[model samples]
Target chain A: SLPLAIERRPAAWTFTLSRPEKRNALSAELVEALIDGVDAAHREQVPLLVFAGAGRNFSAGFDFTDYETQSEGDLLLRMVRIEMLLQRVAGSPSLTLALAHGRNFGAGVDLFAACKWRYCTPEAGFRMPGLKFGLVLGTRRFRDIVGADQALSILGSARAFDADEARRIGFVRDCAAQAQWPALIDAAAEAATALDPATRATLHRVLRDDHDDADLAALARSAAQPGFKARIRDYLAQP
Target chain B: ASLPLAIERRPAAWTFTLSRPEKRNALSAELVEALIDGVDAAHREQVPLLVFAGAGRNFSAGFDFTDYETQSEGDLLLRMVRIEMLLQRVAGSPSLTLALAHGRNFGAGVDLFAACKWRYCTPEAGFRMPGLKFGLVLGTRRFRDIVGADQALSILGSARAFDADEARRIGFVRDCAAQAQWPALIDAAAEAATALDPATRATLHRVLRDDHDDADLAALARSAAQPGFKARIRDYLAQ
Candidate 1:
């Protein structure tokens, strides 16, 4: 089965993470699929793009099940790829939406933060433990969304926060029950399509400052450190 | 006539009020100089708190366009540089800063508000940043720092006015308080400002902010130095 399912709806394109067995962890294959889906949406000038997952949990962030078998070089390359995918989704001309549920961590939370419109179910929880593993993925973007003080507090503690706390800090746009998602998506689609395609494109372009190179360099510096696997192992070993 | 800005000093804080009500408190050359002088005095005194507010119906109408056709483009460029320098001073101040805005605020006035540590506005207050519409890149980074890229883009890209509700929702202003509550708000801010030792508070402020002063200045200069600067602004204003 495909790691990601891309649905082309009349109003928006939805990409659902389909590897429920692994809790939709971002494997190399899954990251590639997401990158491809995002690129396709850009090429087609889709007005809105939505992200969801098909499982009990939205994502478990980085997939570590097979890390023991991969070389350090291979693992670092995978991280670079994930950062590339995130940058694409963040800077996409089309409006982006993320509907997160269950628990999310690391790059999965990063993915949600990259979107313009972010919503989560009442039970959704988020944690960014990248720093625990000596990684610096998506730090700037997180700061952009939540402000510097809040980002520092959350990342320094590497703590998990519930949807209400997330909403209070301006991380997620709103928290609603899963059943209400359909109406929210419909409303988002209407907002996304209100302007002409050209106007929308210009609007998105002017609002963002490009930091792709800096972000990639930071990720590479952290991921390429010696004993990268050992760092991940240490992080995972924590009870 | 009195100075364009009024400086009032108290033990806990110093207040700088834009006093040119007849001019809608626009940042004129004289007004900019007065503000810089007041900020310098506050720094020399090591004031723990600095508060910014304005007199008249609006906080500020942004850059003063008085006799714009009489001034050369080079003169205009210098004025923009000075305003940017003023913003940098306020943003990087050693003291805790607060802004109390009412009615309508625009451009550099809004920039002043964004630089503060605490920002509050009346329920009827509105704001807009239209520098980009005139091909000037003043305060872009500070604005982005407060509101993030997407909202920054939406507002600055359109050069549209946003009311207090939208501002609060976007994390632009800290809160929407009525005019009557401002005294209590300032009292609370003053208490917080002096809670820590001046040295520790200054260090905290320094560490919390990312430094991009040089880059921001260079960007403003490059955009402002371009040929047809006046003509571009004229066209934007005429629209």
Candidate 2:
């Protein structure tokens, strides 16, 4: 059903989280699906890509329910997989747009920052309450786009900003009514095509400049640590 | 005849002036050549401060657009490339560059000023033209870096000059010193230049040039490679 619901437009491709009824929560199964989908999209050389959700939330983040009790090795393997999917989709030679509306949370914010450009409606809302649940700065990738200072203000403070605030910071390149999703996606597709591939490649390379190899790998390694999971659980249970 | 260049030494600094008052202090190709030579000579003499201000009511009208009539595409590209290279050298140099202004400062001069660590001017000066419309890309990232993206999108979209006070409010300038403050302000800047530590200052210059990511570097290179850029050079040559 997830595979069938994914939409592909001629100009670009769209990957949707079909289970809106579940707030499009990211589970291990869905993460695998995303990896496969992004791999296919890149292989075909689509000029634009979209990761959208059918329901209200882009995602409530990784499905904690699936991991109420899990193996450290399992979490590690899954994290490596998740990080790969996010890296591929975010760094795809094609421009990627993450469309958000209603409410977005957790890994949703992380995913939103991964795109070359992010566009959303005026109603979109973003937050990372995961820190309250004991998450630290998971990666510098998120910090790089948002800048370290602003990222600290929002993530450390665990504050929420509506779409207008997001656009103010250059997070959303374009905005429109929720009804205009189809055309907005097309516009993004056209914008990506309008990019001279040579420059687009250069732009991507410069923005993601890597000073150290340990950065992304460390993020992946840390996110899946059993110690982190225990801390999240403890923080969730605190007085 | 082009501007007669003169250097006025004041302690730690050397004031380089365009001596062609009749030419509205225009920087012809020959003038830039002479200016570069002056700068190199100053460097050899261990000049800590570089103050560039014109001799007349005009600071610089930039390139003589009329000369476009005699140019080849290679000449325009080479000239344009030279402007950037010269700006890069000034920005990367041990000496701090200051462009003091009154009346007019336009085109390549804007990029040149931005290459400096600081800029100050007056209400009498107006920065005009379409560096954006011409499909040429240049300037400090701080315009977008400090005030944020929305500010850049709005200001850059218009390509119109705002007042120096407004530029100061947006954090582009140290302050808009009045004409009365001009001599003292420049004297103070030159004085301040001598206090900088060579090793520390070099690191600061390298940090911005080093770049942070692949995507950003690619974008920087692409803007330099666009067809619109090529067309602008062609149009300049046909003039």
Candidate 3:
């Protein structure tokens, strides 16, 4: 009922956040569970990882329903933890893949972007509702994925796009059918194991350590901003 | 599918062109299989060098997307995946490879360059990619590697047409020469070849490949129109 499930494949590990019932909200408990899941996955040296949310949605992108009324520091902290968890997948020695379907919005998308390769279904849709809700993420990760201009478009308009536009803009790697997914994961897992393990570990370290440092620094500055506090209040007022 | 290589030797230089001009050198399935075979064959055949230019005016324009006009999205993408796999081998070849972009070296062409020892083009050439507009996620890893992420994003979003002068400045090409001056161009290429021994080239490639991977995957990865991109296509169709 908590909207999360974890599975281990034949050669890889998977963490499924099943709560499309609540659009797979990223509550505090979910974040903690997420860390635990990844930690275990890492300990197992899982080579390929699949991070997804269930029930026609991908983590409804950060459980915005009660986001308002939270303290400004609290809001940013919650988002940082959630978004950082997404980053941690790729940062792991395992290769990360995202299987997205249905409607994804707000930080829902931020979660998918955190992975290395994102595969989508034709019915999937995405938009960042944060700009309109006056929300700002704890870091600059969005700019890194969709680039500055496209990020501006999403942030400015919060416009929704279908799979074709998503693929066109380099978001998804083209639509992925469920049937091909297992093979994709198996191939990724094999490739990961074949790589020099130490070097792979180093690669993850370099990427995450640097990005997290910047995120922590920026969080300090943004936590004090009025906009963040306002967004927290605005989001909490939502359903 | 097998990608093959013809062993053509000119004095001390060994040349290997795509030889599939029949389809604009669009990396066909057979070429992909042949390429994997070629990489292994060349490694075993004691070939000290490699070259990958098209026999015709252009390099690979990626997959033969024309075949996808009426195919299911699933089938269309399978071919694209194969193309990427082939390009990976080209990029990770045992020996040094080079690209002579005598014509429209768009799409996967840049990727082929990123995998090469050095890349050069003609003064009359123009570089343009509607990748952000027309095609799918072809080479973000390569694009980010050759140029910085910000510049790559700009090109992707606007799908701008850039000429040889601008391309060279942006690190897209190392040098540009008059097409008629093949001798001078070849000499310059030979100069790049002379810059490093085989061992040194491998080391440089290893180090740079790691660096390039860092760029392609850092930040939030890809944010919008992601997994739910199918919605974009359906929506587009409805319109």
Candidate 4:
């Protein structure tokens, strides 16, 4: 099955993570699928792009199930690709949206944070444990969304927070039940088209904080370190 | 007969009030110079606290765009540079700084508030930063520092007005209080400002923030010096 399902509508498009059996972890294949979807959305000039997931959880972040078989170089390349995917979504010209539910961690939460409009179910939660593994993925973007202090507090402790704290700290825009998502998406679609395409594009370009080079470099530096898999294993072994 | 900015000395702090009520306390060239002078004086005197307020219906309406056609683009560029300098000074000040805002504040007005360590506003206060509409990058970094890059992009990109509630939620302002309560707040801030020894307090302020003064000024200059600066402003105003 395809790792990601692309749903197209007249006004909006949805990219749903479809790897439910693995809890939608951002494996190499899944990351590549997301990159392709995001690139296509930009090329097609999609007005509103929505991100969602299938099955039990939004995402379990990075996949480590087969790390033992992959060399450190391979793992590093995968991590860089994930960072690239995030940058693309974060800097997309289209009005981006994310609807998250269940427990999201690591890169999954980073994806949600990357979008312009983020919403989640009342019970949805998030955590970022990249620091525990010495990776600096999405640090600036997270700081961009929630302010530097809050970002430090969450990432420093690698703590999990529920939707309430997310909304309180301006991470997610709102919290709603699953039933209300359709109406929310409809409203977002309408809002996305309110501005002409050129205006929306200009607005996104002028306002976006372009730190792609620095963020990518940071990720590469951390991921390139030797013992990358050992670090991940240690992180997983913790309580 | 009155100065554009009024400087008042309190027991523990110095208050600088933007005094041009007729201009909605807009930052005219004279007002900008007066503010810089006031800050310089406070620094020389080793003042423990500095407070910014306004004499009119609004804390500020941002840059004074009056008679824009009369000034050359070079003159306008200089003005923008000066404003950035003032912001950098306030943000890096050795003394504690506070901004008490009310009414509808826009552009550099919001930047000034963002530069301070303590920012409080009336419950009815509203804020917007539309400098990007005219292609001026003034105060972009400071605003990002306060509210994070995402909210900064969302607000400044749209040039949208956000109320005090939204501002507080995003950590833009410390709190929302009515005008009547500002006296108490300032009094309390004064105590906090002087709580530590002056040297330690100054060191704390100096070390706590990352310095981007040179980069911010360069960005302002580059954007302001772009060709068709006047035409851009006129077009933005026309829209």
Candidate number with greatest TM-score: 4
What is the fnat of candidate 2?
A: 0.00
Candidate 3 regions with alpha-carbon error over 4 angstroms: A66-69, A203-209, A223-239, B1-144, B147-184, B187-239
- Leading candidate by DockQ: 4
| lDDT tens digits by residue: candidate 1, A1-239 | 98999999876999999999998999999999999889988999998999998988778888988788999998999999999999999988788889999999899999988888899999999999889888999999998788899999999989999999999998987898889999988877877775546546655654676788999999999999998889888877847
TM-score of chain A of 4: 0.97
Docking class of predicted structure 2: incorrect
lDDT (tens digit, per residue) of candidate 3 on B65-132: 55544656555455556556656666665566766776665665556655675777888776655443
- Residue-level error in angstroms, candidate 4, position A156: 10
Q: Which stretches of candidate 1 lie over 4 Å from their true place?
A: A1-30, A36-50, A53-76, A87-95, A101-109, A123-171, A177-239, B1-17, B37-52, B65-76, B92-99, B116-120, B130-136, B143-211, B223-239
TM-score of each: 0.65, 0.69, 0.53, 0.76
By DockQ, the better pick of 1 and 2 is 1
In model 1 chain A, which range of ten residues has the least summed lDDT? A194-203
Candidate 1 vs candidate 3: which has greater DockQ?
1
lDDT of 4 by residue, A45-152 (tens): 898999999998889888988788889998899999999999999888888999999999899999988899899999899999889889899999988778789988
Q: Candidate 1 chain B: minimum summed lDDT over ten consecutive residues — where?
A: B150-159
Superposed by TM-score, candidate 1 places the C-alpha of residue B61 at a distance from the truth, in angstroms, of 1.6
Best-to-worst ranking by lDDT: 1, 4, 2, 3
